Amino acid sequence: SEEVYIGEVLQTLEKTGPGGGLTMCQVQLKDQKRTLYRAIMGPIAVGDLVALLDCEREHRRG
Amino acid sequence: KDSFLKKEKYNLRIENFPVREVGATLVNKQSTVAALEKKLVGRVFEANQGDITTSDSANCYRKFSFKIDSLAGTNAHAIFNGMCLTSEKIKGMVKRGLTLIEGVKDVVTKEGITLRILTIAQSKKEKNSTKKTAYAKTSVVKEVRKNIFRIVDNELNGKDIEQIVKKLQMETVGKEIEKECQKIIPLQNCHVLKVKVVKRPVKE
Amino acid sequence: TKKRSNNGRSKKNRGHTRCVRCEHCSAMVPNDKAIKKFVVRSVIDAASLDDLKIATIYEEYEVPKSYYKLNYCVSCAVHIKLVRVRSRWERKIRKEQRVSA
Amino acid sequence: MKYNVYIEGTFSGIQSIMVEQVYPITIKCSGCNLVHKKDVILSIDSINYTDKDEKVNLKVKCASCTRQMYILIKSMATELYEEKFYCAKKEDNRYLASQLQGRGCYIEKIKDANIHVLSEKGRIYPDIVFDEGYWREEDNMNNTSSIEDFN
Amino acid sequence: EQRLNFALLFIKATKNDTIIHATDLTGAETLAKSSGGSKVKAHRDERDPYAAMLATQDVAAVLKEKGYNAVHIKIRGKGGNQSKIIGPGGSTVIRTMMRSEFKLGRVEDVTPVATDSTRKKGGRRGRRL
RNA sequence: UAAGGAGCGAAGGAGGGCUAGAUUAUUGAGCAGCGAGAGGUGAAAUUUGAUGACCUGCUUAGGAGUAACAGAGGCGAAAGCGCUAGUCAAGAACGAAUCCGAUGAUCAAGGACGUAGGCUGGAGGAUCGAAGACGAUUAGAGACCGUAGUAGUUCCAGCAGUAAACGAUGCCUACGCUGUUGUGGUUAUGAGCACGGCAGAAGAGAAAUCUAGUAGGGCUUUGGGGAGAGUACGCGCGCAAGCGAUAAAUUUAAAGGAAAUUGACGGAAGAACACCACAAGGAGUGGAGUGUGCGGCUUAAUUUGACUCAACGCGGGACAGC
Ligand SMILES: [Zn+2]
Numbered sequence: 001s002e003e004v005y006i007g008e009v010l011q012t013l014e015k016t017g018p019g020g021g022l023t024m025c026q027v028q029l030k031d032q033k034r035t036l037y038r039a040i041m042g043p044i045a046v047g048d049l050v051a052l053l054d055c056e057r058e059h060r061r062g
Numbered sequence: 063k064d065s066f067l068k069k070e071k072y073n074l075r076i077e078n079f080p081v082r083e084v085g086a087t088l089v090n091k092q093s094t095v096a097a098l099e100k101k102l103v104g105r106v107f108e109a110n111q112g113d114i115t116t117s118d119s120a121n122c123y124r125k126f127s128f129k130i131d132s133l134a135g136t137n138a139h140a141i142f143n144g145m146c147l148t149s150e151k152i153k154g155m156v157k158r159g160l161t162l163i164e165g166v167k168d169v170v171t172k173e174g175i176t177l178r179i180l181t182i183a184q185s186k187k188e189k190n191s192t193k194k195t196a197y198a199k200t201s202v203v204k205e206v207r208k209n210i211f212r213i214v215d216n217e218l219n220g221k222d223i224e225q226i227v228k229k230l231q232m233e234t235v236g237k238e239i240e241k242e243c244q245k246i247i248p249l250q251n252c253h254v255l256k257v258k259v260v261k262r263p264v265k266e
Numbered sequence: 267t268k269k270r271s272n273n274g275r276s277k278k279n280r281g282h283t284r285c286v287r288c289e290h291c292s293a294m295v296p297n298d299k300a301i302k303k304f305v306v307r308s309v310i311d312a313a314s315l316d317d318l319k320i321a322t323i324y325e326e327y328e329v330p331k332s333y334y335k336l337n338y339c340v341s342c343a344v345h346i347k348l349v350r351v352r353s354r355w356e357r358k359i360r361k362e363q364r365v366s367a
Numbered sequence: 368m369k370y371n372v373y374i375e376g377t378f379s380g381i382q383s384i385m386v387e388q389v390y391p392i393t394i395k396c397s398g399c400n401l402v403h404k405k406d407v408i409l410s411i412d413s414i415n416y417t418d419k420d421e422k423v424n425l426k427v428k429c430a431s432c433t434r435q436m437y438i439l440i441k442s443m444a445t446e447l448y449e450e451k452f453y454c455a456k457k458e459d460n461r462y463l464a465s466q467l468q469g470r471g472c473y474i475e476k477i478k479d480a481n482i483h484v485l486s487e488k489g490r491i492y493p494d495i496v497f498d499e500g501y502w503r504e505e506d507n508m509n510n511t512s513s514i515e516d517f518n
Numbered sequence: 519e520q521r522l523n524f525a526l527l528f529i530k531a532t533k534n535d536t537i538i539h540a541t542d543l544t545g546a547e548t549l550a551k552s553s554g555g556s557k558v559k560a561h562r563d564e565r566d567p568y569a570a571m572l573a574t575q576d577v578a579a580v581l582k583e584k585g586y587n588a589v590h591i592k593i594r595g596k597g598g599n600q601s602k603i604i605g606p607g608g609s610t611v612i613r614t615m616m617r618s619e620f621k622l623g624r625v626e627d628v629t630p631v632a633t634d635s636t637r638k639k640g641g642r643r644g645r646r647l
Numbered sequence: 648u649a650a651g652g653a654g655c656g657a658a659g660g661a662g663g664g665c666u667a668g669a670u671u672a673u674u675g676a677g678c679a680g681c682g683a684g685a686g687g688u689g690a691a692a693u694u695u696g697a698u699g700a701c702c703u704g705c706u707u708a709g710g711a712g713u714a715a716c717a718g719a720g721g722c723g724a725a726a727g728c729g730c731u732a733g734u735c736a737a738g739a740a741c742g743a744a745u746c747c748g749a750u751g752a753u754c755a756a757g758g759a760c761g762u763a764g765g766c767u768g769g770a771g772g773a774u775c776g777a778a779g780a781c782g783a784u785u786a787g788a789g790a791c792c793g794u795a796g797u798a799g800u801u802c803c804a805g806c807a808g809u810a811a812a813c814g815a816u817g818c819c820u821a822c823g824c825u826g827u828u829g830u831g832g833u834u835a836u837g838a839g840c841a842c843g844g845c846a847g848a849a850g851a852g853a854a855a856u857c858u859a860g861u862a863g864g865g866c867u868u869u870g871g872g873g874a875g876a877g878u879a880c881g882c883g884c885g886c887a888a889g890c891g892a893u894a895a896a897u898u899u900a901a902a903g904g905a906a907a908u909u910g911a912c913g914g915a916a917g918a919a920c921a922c923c924a925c926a927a928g929g930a931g932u933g934g935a936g937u938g939u940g941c942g943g944c945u946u947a948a949u950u951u952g953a954c955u956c957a958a959c960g961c962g963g964g965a966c967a968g969c
Pocket of ligand 1: 339
């Protein structure tokens, strides 16, 4: 079923993964206090909006 | 042939703690009370202090052990069988640059049960002092250990099990040791580490 | 020619010392010569703590840690890259390494 | 992993079944569980080596996890007919053609095998083709050779 | 609503294999048991995080059938005079049990350490490779 | 006497012998639960399991060991010594207005100790494991790896006498720069005495470095270019294994002799870089027929160079004659 959370990217940190495909990012959710750390794989600009399937799964390494 | 269908649950009950009932155990169904006694009596379980009390979340470092003793209807009644500190506590306590002090002693209850007790303490580094290590001299360690044995003898020898269990709950022996031995040297982490039942008297 | 002033070991004012066994190959190595490594590892991985927060029955929970001291012989320490070959002036520098997790 | 290649069916008028030790196979990586994107030809005459100099009939790198996968054919043939054809070993109601030994992979499917029949009259039928699991031939002396329910 | 019906779960995690085994609180009755080697084919995969995860699901299913809801976890490596680090796979059994519905009680490391020990295998030189 | 021995006072240490106890762990048996695999590796096979393994309980029986704390920490003549109490002798250092008075240094011969492995007799036998036997790998493995397995590994009474028994630096006794950090006593609290670690300096040395500075202080061991040779004959010890001590003939211009310098090499380690590298993306080649070059075979002749990148529509190599 189509659960979704929309989150705003505030910072990018590190090019990451084999071949440097991913970017570590900090994201704040739009309607909750939660702020997460996540890896994202496309090109990303600060102030982008991204759609998450989970509000909890995290990349603690930051 | 689903053998699981053919099993009887019984509830475990305990004494001298705030919580009376702690769980339930299976057995295959049997015709004769003598068989059920021989199957259930002699079993053992363990429970954390934090589960059988209402208490500060800090007190999770200690476990109590109970042996099944008697059957009445739905209920099995179980008796005190020892005490133990959790592995995280023991391993996390030891640090480089300090001395460990350790002891073993045997005591007798008024009920006739004989118990063996293990005890630990650690030296402490004083404030306004600049040397890297705070080891204790070997002769001084013997002074502390000598004192520990008279404290354990005074507190636990010739008492009832109902009295011993509450002393272990409230951690009175640790507290007494830190008070009494401060004159010799400063100490920290004083605890009863393990309690073990050695002989139970032949009784009916 | 003599490569190190301390013969590669920490023994002084003694005849003989206890041996210990290598974690990787079980070879015997003297305690005063063995390469030592300290570990403090959580029982639960970082990628599960966000599930633990909804799984636990308690109001709050502290994850248990596990503690280890590991010993290695020279060959294993070099091969596993705990230590590396160094220049004639670098050999003399002594500094404490981090505790692993 | 070891896999025996059986030829199963109802055999009539057949002295021996001979099998080309050339198998089009589907392989799955035992590391990442991904199926290889194409079938691979496993042949007894293909000579390859492991990274430890062991002879194998197939060496394939997994495209996803880069792990090496190896397969060796052990012919179970009791004899070579005309020095060319591997006579499958008769076992009760079936024929054991070969044993495939996979390392780093699973064999998920054997697609086809080229089969030759030696009749009880000493006639060879090369490269027999099954229609819906059936094969049948008659000789000039009205002797029938057949395979039914081929698997 | 319902009370927490608890079982024990034991986990062994070596370099070679992982074993998962549920019991009553007494440890004297067995409810369900599995291993990494039960589900996988290749011998090199019996320690695999994946094989551990498959094997955990079967155990979780049988417990849900027998009507259990909550679990205490006691986990170990091999110990004795051998290796005493928890192997791969051990920490994925626990996370899997949490994706299934089960409530987690308490976790404890129960590896058998020796105060001193018998002589280890391998001779004075050790394995040469 | 900042020479020695005897003695007094308070204290310190894994120094040694004996007596009585201890928390776990590894194996083995008994019984109970469960019903299919366990073990081992880089990857696998020997191997073991429905006579119920593995894993989880409760009982027991043995014989070793003292984890973490634990260190450029302590003790001992060296070899060596790490759980807790009690007991028995002697020693080192320190404090100080105790006693005797040259009793001392070093040492052929002679005597006592000496890790481990080995040997003679008794006790015992958990774990590990020479020999021996298998499974794999290889051209071959008798080896390395895995399964298993004996003498030994432990104790008491003895024999033996060797180690890279090394800080590769003899023992007493001197004269000698600074800073820092330990251990045990004592203190006018300023410091000392004994036993150490570390970092410079100055001198020294072929250098590397410094137990190596200064010097006709005393006494013992010991070397004299490589080899043959720590071998032969004789002798002394030992149950044996062997050990101690020690030659000639013959050969040869240097010696894998010492340390330091530059290259070449390695199956090392560490940083960098690049679609003629890769990762994420496009078009193909490898399969068919044909065109063309290379090897092989044939022929009277099928003329010939070139072989990893950096040989093979390459030798301006599309040959009817040229
Ligand atoms: Zn090693």
